[PDB]
Design a protein around this ligand. Structure first.
Ligand SMILES: O=C(Cn1c2c(c(=O)n3nc(N4CCOCC4)nc13)C1(CCN(C(=O)c3ncccc3O)CC1)OCC2)Nc1ccc(C(F)(F)F)cc1Cl
Ligand SMILES: [Zn+2]
Length: 430
């Protein structure tokens, strides 16, 4: 019988990934993991490990889609991956699942060494699970495996356990600081369910990670309300609905970021809000380091209510009480949009994310993309613009579209009490 009915009339897996997984990467994913496609975050982590050997901190709310990020890379290159974890029963479960998928894998510890260690040294295992206690006393073994086989990655699960400041400190994690000393060229993928910026900083310091890629996925973010609205042809007409008059000035409900495509538009929008004596500042790459760091400082100190910025603004901010994100103009693509709205309401309190768009917007202009001479990049950019256009045009649940694109199916299936309600999105309200 038919297992799915996903195909739609007038629509034509790899599309929204840059660069695209190659044919053998997809064959490997189907053969060894029983999946047809990578989710964007899975590909971000996997590609960063394989092609850049880049350290990662991957915050993942649950195990749903998590294991692929550290299991896939060593399976594809046919070398070895190390998984460091204190979760013995889960490690045993994953080892058995790997064996049943015809991936040679084992649990290495003192009591298991007689059975598996010689075979690990001879490169017979793709994936080896070890405790931090065992790992701490065997840096010499890891150096031998790096020399004779090549370690694709070291995964550190429950990575928050390295922080004295967290709620689950393990003495056993302290010595994992030595991994980067012993193995400076082996990328570490640190995994945790804690989205705390403070704990992330502790993990990066304690594991000596170098410019790590930070991702945060597996969350349904029920406190983010999503709306797409047409521009009215006037900045003040467009932004007046967001404003409240108090004393002899206008303000937003709370701390607000307005993302504009152009530097010109950030100055144009700032100018209009300044006329209302609204507490705000501009942020783009055309400003100096001094001015940019001051805008950041004043926003964190709540000395400005609103930052009117290009998408240069965001990565540096850990601010938990962003009440409103406005995309003033169509966003660059759904990837950029997801990164930008993800910064809203990190305190878990009610926030709103509005796109104000026109069919005329620069990020919907095909002319700029047709000028791209590289065929693969041109077609990718056109596919991303089309996907962004489809989101803006949709009458379907905005949350369902974003979760379907970016998250494991479980985030939709585990999402209870927001989708279809008045607080979900404009399309669920109406
Ligand atoms: O929002 C998420 C996940 N998420 C993401 C982020 C984040 O901070 N948080 N925080 C929480 N919370 C989980 C629950 O507890 C509070 C924190 N969840 C996320 C960032 C982390 C990287 N980043 C940075 O600037 C950054 N930072 C530090 C260092 C380097 C960096 O590059 C951008 C924001 O990435 C995007 C994903 N999913 C999500 C779910 C539903 C929807 C909606 F259906 F409603 F549309 C939309 C989205 Cl986007
Ligand atoms: Zn909805």
């Amino acid at each position: 019988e038919d297992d799915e009915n996903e195909a739609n009339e007038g629509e034509e897996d790899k599309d929204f990934l840059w660069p695209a997984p190659n044919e053998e990467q997809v064959t490997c994913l189907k053969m060894y993991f029983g999946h047809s496609s990578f989710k964007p975050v899975q590909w971000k982590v996997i590609h960063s490990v394989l092609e850049e050997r880049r350290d990662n901190v991957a915050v993942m709310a649950t195990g749903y889609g998590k294991s692929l990020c550290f299991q896939y890379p060593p399976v594809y290159v046919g070398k070895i991956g190390l998984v460091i974890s204190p979760l013995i029963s889960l490690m045993e479960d994953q080892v058995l699942q790997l064996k049943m998928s015809n991936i040679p894998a084992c649990f290495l510890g003192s009591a298991q060494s007689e059975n598996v260690l010689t075979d690990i040294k001879l490169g017979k295992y793709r994936i080896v699970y070890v405790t931090p206690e065992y790992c701490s006393g065997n840096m010499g073994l890891l150096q031998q495996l790096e020399a004779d086989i090549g370690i694709t990655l070291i995964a550190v699960d429950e990575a928050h356990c390295i922080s004295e400041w967290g709620h689950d400190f393990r003495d056993s994690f302290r010595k994992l600081g030595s991994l980067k000393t012993a193995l400076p060229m082996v990328p570490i993928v640190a995994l945790t369910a804690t989205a705390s910026s403070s704990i992330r900083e502790d993990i990066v310091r304690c594991l000596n990670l170098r410019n790590p890629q930070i991702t945060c996925t597996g969350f349904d973010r029920p406190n983010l309300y999503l709306e797409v609205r047409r521009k009215t042809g006037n900045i003040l007409q467009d932004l007046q609905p967001f404003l409240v008059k108090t004393s002899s000035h206008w303000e937003f409900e709370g701390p607000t970021i307005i993302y504009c495509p152009s530097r010109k538009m950030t100055q144009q929008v700032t100018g209009e809000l300044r006329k209302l004596n609204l507490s705000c500042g501009t942020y783009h790459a055309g400003m100096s380091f001094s001015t940019r760091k001051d805008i950041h400082h004043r926003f964190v100190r709540d000395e400005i209510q609103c930052v009117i910025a290009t998408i240069a603004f965001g990565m540096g901010i850990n601010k938990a009480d962003i009440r409103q994100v406005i995309h003033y103009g169509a966003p660059k693509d759904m990837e950029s949009y997801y990164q930008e709205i993800g910064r809203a309401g990190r305190d878990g309190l009610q926030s709103s994310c509005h796109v104000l768009w026109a069919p005329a917007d620069i990020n919907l202009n095909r002319h700029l993309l047709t000028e791209i001479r590289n065929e693969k990049f041109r077609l990718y950019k056109l596919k991303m613009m089309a996907k962004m256009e489809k989101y803006l045009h949709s009458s379907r649940c905005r949350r369902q579209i974003i979760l379907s694109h970016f998250e494991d199916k479980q985030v939709q299936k585990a999402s209870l009490g927001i989708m279809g309600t008045e607080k979900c999105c404009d399309n669920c309200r109406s």
